[PDB]
Amino acid sequence: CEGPVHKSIPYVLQPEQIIPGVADYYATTVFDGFDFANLLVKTREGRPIKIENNTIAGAKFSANARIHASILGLYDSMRLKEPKLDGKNSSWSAVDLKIKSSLADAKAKGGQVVLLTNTLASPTTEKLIGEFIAKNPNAKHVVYDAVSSSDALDAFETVYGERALVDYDFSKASLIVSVGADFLGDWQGGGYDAGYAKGRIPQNGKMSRHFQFESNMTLSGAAADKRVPMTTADQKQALVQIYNIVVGASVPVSLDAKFKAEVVKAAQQLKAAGTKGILVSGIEDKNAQLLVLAINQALASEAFSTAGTRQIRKGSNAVVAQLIKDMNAGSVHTLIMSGVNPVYTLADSASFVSGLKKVKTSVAFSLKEDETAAVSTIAAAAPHYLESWGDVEITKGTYSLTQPTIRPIFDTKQFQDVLLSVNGTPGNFYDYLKANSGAIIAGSSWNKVLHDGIFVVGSAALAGGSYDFAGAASLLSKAKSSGELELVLYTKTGMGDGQHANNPWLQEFPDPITRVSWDNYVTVSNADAKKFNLSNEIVANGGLNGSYATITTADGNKLENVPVIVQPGQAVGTVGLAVGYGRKAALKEEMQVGINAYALYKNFNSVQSITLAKANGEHEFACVQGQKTLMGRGDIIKETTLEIFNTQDAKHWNEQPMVSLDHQEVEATTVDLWESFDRTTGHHFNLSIDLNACTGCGACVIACHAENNVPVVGKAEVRRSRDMHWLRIDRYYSSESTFEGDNERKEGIAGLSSSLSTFNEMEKPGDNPQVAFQPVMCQHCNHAPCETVCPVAATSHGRQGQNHMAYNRCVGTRYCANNCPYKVRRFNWFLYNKNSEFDYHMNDDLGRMVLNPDVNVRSRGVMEKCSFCIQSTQAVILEAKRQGRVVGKDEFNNACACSAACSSGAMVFGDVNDKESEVAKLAESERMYHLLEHVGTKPNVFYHVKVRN
Amino acid sequence: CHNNSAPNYQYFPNMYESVAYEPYTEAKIFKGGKEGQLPVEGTINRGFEPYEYENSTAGYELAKANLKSPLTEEEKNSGKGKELFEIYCISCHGAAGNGKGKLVEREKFLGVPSYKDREITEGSIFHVETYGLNAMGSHANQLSAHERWLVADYVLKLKSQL
Amino acid sequence: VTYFVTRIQLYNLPFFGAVVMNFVFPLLILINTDFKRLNWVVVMAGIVILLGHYVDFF
Ligand code: HEC
Ligand SMILES: *C(=O)CCCCCCCCC
Ligand code: SF4
Ligand code: F3S
């Protein structure tokens, strides 16, 4: 074939800031009403690519997995490219005139004007809204949250005086008592990962222990030291029992004796740790939240403070309800909303729509023609964050600016620009921001603020006051609703809300706990499964199948749900249900997957009483992980206890394998018939996981699939367990409640009659076991079995110590997937690039901008592998060689995004021959430990030890 | 068979053309036909400050009076300021002399003065080297903001030898 | 693996000499069919083989 003709287009007029081949970084922020963070945007010659974290003295809000995958919304070809009016394509001038004339009529008639939004923490946006209201006599501004937290806000407001949340510092407490907290999840915008993990490292003989009380099962439960299955009717009583101990009081708590046996212990210990303890609870009752405030004041702990309150969640379930009622009751005129989606998130949306039928000039700002854009008057085309200007105040004492990084792709207009035009203010929102920037920024205007991204503002603690908490305690103890089976709604790490309905990276991203993808489900405990005859099963092709079930509530039902029998998932008499998947407007049927459940969020309560019935058919699941338990293989995750760590020699908790010589024992690593190669000079690399800091390691996955151009595979072809992932997080349950209980059944064994029955019972996980996580990638071995058998010699090793993988000689005779004992090697099977069988972002022309040009895209028949960050470390050596310097201490660690994007300090990358780096101080430790040292493969990635107590 | 006015034949081009977007090629989707779309006005990337003086006759002598060199003595005595003058400046101005160059001998275009005639401060080079005075052009596309100051110290050493 | 480590490092000549005597020597002797009929060729080879297998057990 002739081979195509390649052309190149230089500029007519080249801008000073752009150099071809040189990446640029911009300081921006994000806040979409649910998630928020401070971050850097890496851009090419004109466009944004993979999101980095902003760490310039304001590294308080790193990006989560949902934020890292948000770039696909920018390059989504399914966006409202042009605004519509009355269902037809129209100009913005048409929109402007329509809105202005309706406002004039509302003023003349004396009607109602309502703006709807969501937690716009912005000094200048709020000011602008205030100006709108000042000019318009009858404007009400109202805030609507999908998942609400108004009970917490009421408790804080009525004590301290404002609607804000307490930003707890989990690194300043030794005893954490959690009652339905879930602070490692989405609880109050969970960003407490680093705070928690920091206190889990045994630096000396100290370690913060965690007490988990809960109905569901979550990551904080998995990361807890103690976990007590408890229903919501028990949790309320347990909270009062805690209160009576920390705060001397006599309130008649009704609680199960076995529960009291543990609740009392925890409460007494909490009390003992004066100033070093913390009570956190997620009970949807203001009275319960008030008791939490009372107890934390009594403890007077360092983790509790009102000096920097959180401005992120400021809604109200009373105001929203009033709004809905008035839309149907009275006459409401022009309603304008932005980022608000009641149809589908509102449980009473049927009445909301009937309210919409009674209002005039409904204006909705969005990215897609969703369910509310449909039922409206004007569909306004909004910009996607990187196409707009703004400013955000996450906490009480901070100010930050948001820069656009790409010029508007589609014909959009900012919400604030619309407000300025109807107010009669000349210019635009950017000019407005400039004029109002000096009110906060006392330093240099742009040069030291836009350049860095943030600005520091002082603050002060809020005054408290007298309040009858004893009364609240008696109200909570008297409160009681003990009936039948109930469910609890929750959000996921891959699915926070409906802003990522068609995001293929989050659809593919498997659940960190249940290990499944591309679907919703119902969590039922095994004790309940036996009563309802529900079950799951592994089929011949390797995937999972399971029964269907029906959920019935007061005056309603679902009629078809997909249950997963998670053994310890539910305590007893409770059901877990994820909320946020059932979307149908403006998206393809491949993305229209799952169950919504928002209709069950009656009166904004997450806890509902239900009836569960077994259905008729059977469902197939795209399940990623097969086996649930660990077979007693202590040579995989070594665990011990704190007092053993402190009092016993390493020989008793971190023992390495021995091999016999001339009637003598020696460390297995000393036996070798071959000769080694000299890698003592020139940058020998390693990589360090410590298992205490591994909470869920959620956002570490998506950042590794950002440079490396790993394609997206659908529900099928993952259902057959043939997915493409370079690093994976594991999930190991236990039988009989401990990991040491799965090592006493195995070491005590008999001959061939009992060993056919014990190894068949050790794959059924018992009730309330212990959970352990383990990140597994391709540790670049030295005596690597995947090397020697490649007939076409596509793999080799370097002097630095990698496993170099050429994508050229790999003529796919699939040997090297077999000799890897860890077996992390992903052959590709179809062509994932441009065919119509995979209609994801790799196919369409508008969505092939996420792909960086520095890493090639594989075609067919070649294998791929989690290499070390070659495309960054070959640039760090490059940028340290042109200058004439030596590479710094933390310069290798900040470039490889396998380590430079995780929340906690779990992943540590860097140099070893440099004896002053962070890796060389971790390799010389009493917890030095490799996977499978008896194999004799010499890996370059070492894990430490779980040191739970 | 292989011709020289057209590229040669290939055997199964598996990974030869690009799925990603290498910088200067032609595409279809973008605003123009290019692949080098312009950044938004008013933004600031990490490691760059905008020049705060406007164009000539009102910002020229305001830059000539009060504007200084933000370098150190370790960087001036390095010889890298001479190498940038060896590339971007001998084509019109002289190398050791002033105004003799390479192109007033060949008489391609005239009107290049010396450095004895016009008194220039160390901040008046930097305003001309970014904008140009009626026959020069913006050399900001070629040199970087750290490197225009390395040239300006070398030009002052050339005037003192004259 | 130490099975061979302690043999190669200590019994160097015994370990490899047993290969030569039980293979290389007869390889170039009992391939000629005329030599296979000679009494002294057969006796000679027989002696070497016996010594070689003694070494094997040693
Ligand atoms: C040919 C296009 C030239 C290049 C290459 C460089 N210079 Fe120049 N320069 C050129 C002309 C024709 C003039 C005079 C224009 C006029 O209207 O008089 C200049 C002027 C200068 C000056 C004096 C400016 C002043 O205000 O008096 C300086 C100090 C100067 N040029 C510096 C300079 C440097 C540092 C260059 C390398 C980047 C360079 N010139 C290149 C023509 C050309
Ligand atoms: C493009 O059409 C030219 C393909 C050249 C193939 C060369 C084959 C050589 C003999 C097997
Ligand atoms: S871990 Fe698997 S892929 Fe990495 S070197 Fe060892 S065998 Fe090869
Ligand atoms: S052994 Fe070799 S040919 Fe490819 S499948 Fe593995 S690199």
DSSP annotation string for A262-293:
HHHHHHHHHHHSTTSEEEEE--S-HHHHHHHH
- d(CA A447, ligand 1 centre) in Å: 30
| Amino acid type, B56 | S
Q: Residues of B forming the annotated binding site for heme c?
A: 60, 89, 92-93, 118, 136
Cα distances (Å, whole numbers) of residue A352 to A98, A359, A554, A812: 23, 11, 21, 58
**Residues of A whose CB is below 8 A from B143:** none
Resolution rounded to one decimal, in angstroms:
3.4
Quick check: A41 and B45 in contact, CB under 8 A? no
DSSP A310: B
**Which stretch of DSSP H or E encloses residue A908?**
strand A908-911
| Amino acid type, A606 | S
Largest CA distance in chain C: 45
Quick check: A382 and B12 in contact, CB under 8 A? no
Angle at A576 between CA A574 and CA A580, to 5 degrees: 150
Quick check: A396 and A308 in contact, CB under 8 A? yes
DSSP A893: T
Quick check: A498 and A507 in contact, CB under 8 A? no
Report whether residue A778 contacts ligand 3, using a CB cutoff of 6 Å. yes
Query: What is d(CA A349, CA A372) in angstroms, rounded to the nearest whole number?
Result: 10
Find all residues with CB under 8 Å of A472, minimum gap 6, and list them.
A287, A290, A291, A294
Query: What is d(CA B143, CA B130) in angstroms, rounded to the nearest whole number?
Result: 9
Query: What is d(CA A276, CA A91) in angstroms, rounded to the nearest whole number?
Result: 61
Query: What is d(CA A764, CA A105) in angstroms, rounded to the nearest whole number?
Result: 69
Chains that touch B (3 or more CB pairs under 8 A): A
Q: Do chains C and A touch (3 or more CB pairs under 8 A)?
A: yes
Q: Which two tokens stand for residue A526?
A: 């095994």
Quick check: A237 and A261 in contact, CB under 8 A? no
Quick check: B64 and A46 in contact, CB under 8 A? no
Query: What is d(CA A381, CA A361) in angstroms, rounded to the nearest whole number?
Result: 16
Cβ contact C1–A661 (<8 Å): no
Quick check: A863 and A826 in contact, CB under 8 A? yes
Angle at A167 between CA A165 and CA A170, to 5 degrees: 145
Cα distances (Å, whole numbers) of residue A709 to A174, A503, A725, A727: 42, 16, 11, 14
For residue A8, how many C-alpha atoms fall within 13 Å in the half-sphere facing its CB?
5
**Chain position carrying tokens 């996607």:** A384
Q: Which two tokens stand for residue A325?
A: 């009622």
Interface of A with B in 425-484 (CB under 8 A): 430, 446-447, 450-451
**Chain position carrying tokens 């594991």:** A730
Largest CA distance in chain A: 103
* SS3 at position A493: coil
Query: What is d(CA B132, CA B127) in angstroms, rounded to the nearest whole number?
Result: 8
Quick check: A8 and B25 in contact, CB under 8 A? yes
Closest residue in chain B to residue A708, using alpha carbons only = B20
Interface of A with B in 859-888 (CB under 8 A): 859-860
CA-CA-CA-CA torsion sign (A28, A31, A35, A36)? positive
Q: Which two tokens stand for residue B129?
A: 């080297």
**Chain position carrying tokens 């809000």:** A61
Rg of chain A over Cα atoms, rounded to whole angstroms, equals 29
Quick check: B162 and B103 in contact, CB under 8 A? no
Query: What is d(CA A911, CA A916) in angstroms, rounded to the nearest whole number?
Result: 9
Give how far B25 is from chain A: nearest CA, Å. 4
**Residues of A whose CB is below 8 A from B45:** 17, 24-26, 43
Q: Looking at ligand 4, which residue's alpha carbon is closest to its atom 3? A: A810
Query: What is d(CA A423, CA A131) in angstroms, rounded to the nearest whole number?
Result: 8
φ, ψ of residue A261 in degrees (nearest 5): -55, -30
CA-CA-CA-CA torsion sign (B96, B97, B98, B102)? negative
Question: Please, what's the b/e burial string for A423-459 (b: 16 or more CB within 10 A of its CB; e: otherwise)?
Answer: eebeebbbebbbeebeeebeeeebeebbbbbbbeeee
**Chain position carrying tokens 């509102």:** A346
Task: Give strand ranges (E) for A144-261.
Answer: 175-179, 209-214, 226-229
Find all residues with CB under 8 Å of A302, minimum gap 6, and list them.
A169, A172, A173, A275, A276
Cβ contact A3–B40 (<8 Å): no
